mmCIF file of C-alpha atoms in Angstrom:
data_model
loop_
_atom_site.group_PDB
_atom_site.id
_atom_site.type_symbol
_atom_site.label_atom_id
_atom_site.label_comp_id
_atom_site.label_asym_id
_atom_site.label_seq_id
_atom_site.Cartn_x
_atom_site.Cartn_y
_atom_site.Cartn_z
ATOM 1 C CA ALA A 1 26.564 6.922 29.210
ATOM 2 C CA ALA A 2 25.194 9.920 31.246
ATOM 3 C CA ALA A 3 23.708 13.522 31.108
ATOM 4 C CA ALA A 4 21.132 13.033 28.259
ATOM 5 C CA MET A 5 20.073 9.498 29.372
ATOM 6 C CA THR A 6 17.833 10.893 32.225
ATOM 7 C CA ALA A 7 14.831 11.502 29.899
ATOM 8 C CA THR A 8 14.393 9.025 26.925
ATOM 9 C CA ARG A 9 15.223 9.144 23.200
ATOM 10 C CA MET A 10 5.264 3.025 4.599
ATOM 11 C CA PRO A 11 3.466 2.466 1.232
ATOM 12 C CA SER A 12 -0.290 3.175 0.621
ATOM 13 C CA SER A 13 -3.196 4.238 2.933
ATOM 14 C CA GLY A 14 -5.479 4.941 -0.087
ATOM 15 C CA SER A 15 -8.036 7.619 0.938
ATOM 16 C CA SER A 16 -10.735 8.636 -1.613
ATOM 17 C CA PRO A 17 -12.960 11.749 -0.806
ATOM 18 C CA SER A 18 -10.191 14.538 -1.196
ATOM 19 C CA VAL A 19 -10.836 18.411 -1.468
ATOM 20 C CA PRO A 20 -14.090 18.752 -3.653
ATOM 21 C CA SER A 21 -17.562 20.228 -2.878
ATOM 22 C CA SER A 22 -20.715 18.706 -1.311
ATOM 23 C CA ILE A 23 -23.459 16.900 -3.397
ATOM 24 C CA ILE A 24 -27.359 16.800 -3.426
ATOM 25 C CA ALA A 25 -30.236 14.839 -5.185
ATOM 26 C CA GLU A 26 -33.946 14.937 -6.377
ATOM 27 C CA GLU A 27 -36.511 12.392 -7.897
ATOM 28 C CA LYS A 28 -38.614 14.297 -10.579
ATOM 29 C CA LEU A 29 -36.862 12.538 -13.467
ATOM 30 C CA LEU A 30 -36.784 11.766 -17.227
ATOM 31 C CA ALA A 31 -39.235 13.198 -19.778
ATOM 32 C CA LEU A 32 -36.207 13.370 -22.134
ATOM 33 C CA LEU A 33 -36.521 10.038 -23.926
ATOM 34 C CA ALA A 34 -39.708 11.352 -25.624
ATOM 35 C CA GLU A 35 -38.008 14.319 -27.435
ATOM 36 C CA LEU A 36 -35.429 11.996 -29.023
ATOM 37 C CA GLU A 37 -38.498 10.520 -30.783
ATOM 38 C CA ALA A 38 -40.231 13.989 -31.207
ATOM 39 C CA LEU A 39 -37.124 15.330 -32.963
ATOM 40 C CA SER A 40 -36.647 12.319 -35.273
ATOM 41 C CA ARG A 41 -40.449 12.200 -36.011
ATOM 42 C CA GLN A 42 -40.671 15.887 -36.944
ATOM 43 C CA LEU A 43 -37.426 15.530 -38.950
ATOM 44 C CA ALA A 44 -39.226 12.937 -41.098
ATOM 45 C CA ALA A 45 -42.268 15.232 -41.429
ATOM 46 C CA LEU A 46 -39.924 17.919 -42.935
ATOM 47 C CA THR A 47 -38.743 15.531 -45.669
ATOM 48 C CA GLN A 48 -42.282 14.229 -46.140
ATOM 49 C CA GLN A 49 -43.478 17.699 -47.179
ATOM 50 C CA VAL A 50 -40.390 18.489 -49.232
ATOM 51 C CA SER A 51 -41.627 15.427 -51.150
ATOM 52 C CA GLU A 52 -45.108 17.029 -51.349
ATOM 53 C CA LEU A 53 -43.574 20.010 -53.162
ATOM 54 C CA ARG A 54 -41.830 17.700 -55.673
ATOM 55 C CA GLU A 55 -44.844 15.368 -56.166
ATOM 56 C CA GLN A 56 -47.015 18.437 -57.028
ATOM 57 C CA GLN A 57 -44.349 20.188 -59.202
ATOM 58 C CA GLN A 58 -43.970 16.935 -61.233
ATOM 59 C CA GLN A 59 -47.691 17.156 -62.294
ATOM 60 C CA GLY B 1 13.556 25.587 52.813
ATOM 61 C CA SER B 2 11.450 22.425 53.299
ATOM 62 C CA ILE B 3 13.419 19.534 54.900
ATOM 63 C CA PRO B 4 12.309 16.435 52.967
ATOM 64 C CA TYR B 5 13.806 14.214 55.681
ATOM 65 C CA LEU B 6 11.188 15.511 58.222
ATOM 66 C CA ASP B 7 8.440 17.411 56.360
ATOM 67 C CA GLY B 8 7.470 14.738 53.838
ATOM 68 C CA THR B 9 7.812 17.034 50.683
ATOM 69 C CA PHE B 10 9.851 14.433 48.758
ATOM 70 C CA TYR B 11 11.032 14.929 45.193
ATOM 71 C CA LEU B 12 13.998 13.340 43.267
ATOM 72 C CA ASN B 13 12.110 9.959 43.176
ATOM 73 C CA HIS B 14 12.186 10.170 39.366
ATOM 74 C CA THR B 15 16.039 10.220 39.569
ATOM 75 C CA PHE B 16 16.285 6.488 40.347
ATOM 76 C CA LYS B 17 17.065 4.206 37.364
ATOM 77 C CA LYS B 18 17.131 0.725 39.003
ATOM 78 C CA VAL B 19 17.853 -1.262 42.171
ATOM 79 C CA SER B 20 18.801 -4.849 42.920
ATOM 80 C CA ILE B 21 18.754 -6.972 46.098
ATOM 81 C CA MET B 22 21.094 -9.890 46.860
ATOM 82 C CA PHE B 23 21.190 -12.121 49.979
ATOM 83 C CA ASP B 24 24.424 -13.971 50.929
ATOM 84 C CA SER B 25 26.043 -12.726 47.659
ATOM 85 C CA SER B 26 24.153 -15.465 45.678
ATOM 86 C CA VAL B 27 20.394 -15.262 46.404
ATOM 87 C CA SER B 28 19.184 -12.603 43.940
ATOM 88 C CA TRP B 29 15.760 -11.494 45.333
ATOM 89 C CA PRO B 30 12.896 -12.032 44.572
ATOM 90 C CA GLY B 31 14.410 -14.144 41.747
ATOM 91 C CA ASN B 32 12.177 -17.120 40.800
ATOM 92 C CA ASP B 33 11.801 -15.615 37.271
ATOM 93 C CA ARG B 34 9.071 -13.320 38.756
ATOM 94 C CA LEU B 35 9.721 -9.987 36.987
ATOM 95 C CA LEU B 36 10.365 -9.039 33.322
ATOM 96 C CA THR B 37 14.015 -8.401 34.497
ATOM 97 C CA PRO B 38 14.099 -11.150 37.180
ATOM 98 C CA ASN B 39 17.349 -10.112 38.954
ATOM 99 C CA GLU B 40 16.434 -6.402 39.511
ATOM 100 C CA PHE B 41 13.746 -3.715 39.843
ATOM 101 C CA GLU B 42 14.108 -1.568 36.698
ATOM 102 C CA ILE B 43 12.408 1.672 37.792
ATOM 103 C CA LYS B 44 12.741 3.533 34.443
ATOM 104 C CA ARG B 45 14.229 3.161 30.891
ATOM 105 C CA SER B 46 16.160 5.612 28.638
ATOM 106 C CA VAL B 47 15.780 3.247 25.617
ATOM 107 C CA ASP B 48 13.017 0.588 25.346
ATOM 108 C CA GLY B 49 13.369 -2.024 22.563
#
């Protein structure tokens, strides 16, 4: 009634960026698709000359 | 000390809660559904719903 009455008396907000580091970029990209063919070409050339041992030993 | 009756120097204005005015014991003034509490001047609120 008196004394104190003179003054006065959720779910999901879904953030995303959190506490990780900063990020950067560059545009000098992508030789790498050539080596996948270099590697599998030269791999064949190994077997090709293993065959050239065998095809001369068989003579 | 200061004499608020003569010096100006008022304080205690914040101590008022509300006041109402009534002519001829029936004419609540200003009435006419004017205010948000039409029958009285509610100076301040301890709870506000």
